Design a protein around this ligand. Sequence first.
Ligand SMILES: Cc1cc2nc3c(=O)[nH]c(=O)nc-3n(C[C@H](O)[C@H](O)[C@H](O)COP(=O)(O)OP(=O)(O)OC[C@H]3O[C@@H](n4cnc5c(N)ncnc54)[C@H](O)[C@@H]3O)c2cc1C
Length: 501
Amino acid sequence: RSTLVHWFRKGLRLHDNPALSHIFTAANAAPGRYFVRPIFILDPGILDWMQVGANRWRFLQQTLEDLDNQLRKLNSRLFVVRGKPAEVFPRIFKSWRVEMLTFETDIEPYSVTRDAAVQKLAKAEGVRVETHCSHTIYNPELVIAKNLGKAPITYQKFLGIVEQLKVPKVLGVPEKLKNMPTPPKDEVEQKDSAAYDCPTMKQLVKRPEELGPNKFPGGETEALRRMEESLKDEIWVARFEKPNTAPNSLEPSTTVLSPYLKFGCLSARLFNQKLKEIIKRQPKHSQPPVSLIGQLMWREFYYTVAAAEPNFDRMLGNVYCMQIPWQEHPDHLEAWTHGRTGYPFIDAIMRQLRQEGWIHHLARHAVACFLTRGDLWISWEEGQRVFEQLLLDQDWALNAGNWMWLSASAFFHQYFRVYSPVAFGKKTDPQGHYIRKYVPELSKYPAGCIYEPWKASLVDQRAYGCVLGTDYPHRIVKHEVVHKENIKRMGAAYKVNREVR
DNA sequence: ACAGCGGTTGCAGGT
DNA sequence: TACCTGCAACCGCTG
Ligand SMILES: Cc1cc2nc3c(=O)[nH]c(=O)nc-3n(C[C@H](O)[C@H](O)[C@H](O)COP(=O)(O)OP(=O)(O)OC[C@H]3O[C@@H](n4cnc5c(N)ncnc54)[C@H](O)[C@@H]3O)c2cc1C
């Protein structure tokens, strides 16, 4: 027999996976002719690379285990092949006698050059390759082409384009494999029968002391359970307005589907389809940009602008990005990174992020504004790096785009609007329950100064069990001064950019 | 040409 | 409640 291979990278699901389904229907169309190998390639070198935190490793570990469990139900399994694609594919193309390889496409620069190299190797070896665009509802290439060769840079124009595009069929889970014995062992499997088994926690998480509570388990099964639980309250879904959801509710005010959508545990096209069905049923409903469907479209929007710019994740060489003379400040960056800025709202958020790997969108706004244009005047690239480490939903395009938005570098330009690290959280948490949870050293402070503890006398600090400078830091900057100076810096940078433009 | 419009998610003070 | 203003004036899109 010859081998059909599906290569999982994102798209870590069985549902709505045309690349995977193509392999399974091809096998059942010619029973006895093929072996099927669903694979994930794991480079064991990067397990101690600092840009992937322990919480995201755990999520991947859990996702891979779920994916194996689901493939087992189809008379298959997951093969987790350790190595780099450049060495792995030449070996397995030969040893498995591979006839066809499928995978879901990705727009990220690294994957573009990785996949081009894979396709070059395949054509040399006479392996067929079939790729599918299913990570996004709309194909960025088609959006850009429909918009005369340019990515739309405003949301309303983007919507106007995608309304003209067709949405492919959402697929179910593939068919069970018929007449599919286990493939014969290759050289690697002959030495170690467990060589391609799912990695353990010990194998994947090198820094387990960095793990926090497992609030958001990995995998497609959890993705679908979580979505279905979200979709149950159709009134909540239909009337959803992002701006009215709280950043500092102890329980998430939004769906927390982002990690599942990032990994492909949940199909964005399926989620889109389910929401459309609800909106048809609910006469009173919100519209984009603020609706739940609108949030999915924001994801589509950023994927499209990112697709057209390999430098999307930096300032220099990035066609969208305002050139702003951000400053280096190691100490302030470290304080922000570790939630020791001395603004309890900011610190609470940065601590929740590190511990749990998800923070609400407007919490992201608050800390990202603070780091960049609002207060510290540090580049959004530094914030991006920290988020990249700590977020379960770390997404190249989404992280870059939203960091440019919040820094008023691209897409958003009204830099006069500046979040207050003192006032913003009060609207939705006047008692400061969120701060009391994530900055417990301040948990006895009255609500009157818990957002602004510098207003407390020394005798009051002592009475509250937390003395500033000892038990919680002094504030690293004075918001009321620096944000006004930074508005002027922003205006000056915009002028310089206009002049070049 | 350039003025006017709308832009997911500002704050403070006011009704 | 949910909206109003002044603050000071940005960008891309439109005609
Ligand atoms: C500084 C900054 C960095 C960010 N980095 C990431 C990131 O790396 N990965 C990521 O997925 N999101 C990122 N976001 C966007 C957004 O905050 C998250 O997607 C959102 O908080 C996810 O929570 P949710 O699933 O409950 O969202 P919901 O409100 O329930 O929305 C559902 C889905 O829509 C999409 N979505 C929602 N908001 C946005 C948005 N503003 N931009 C693009 N897509 C959106 C997500 O896929 C999300 O899961 C970032 C935002 C900011 C301000």
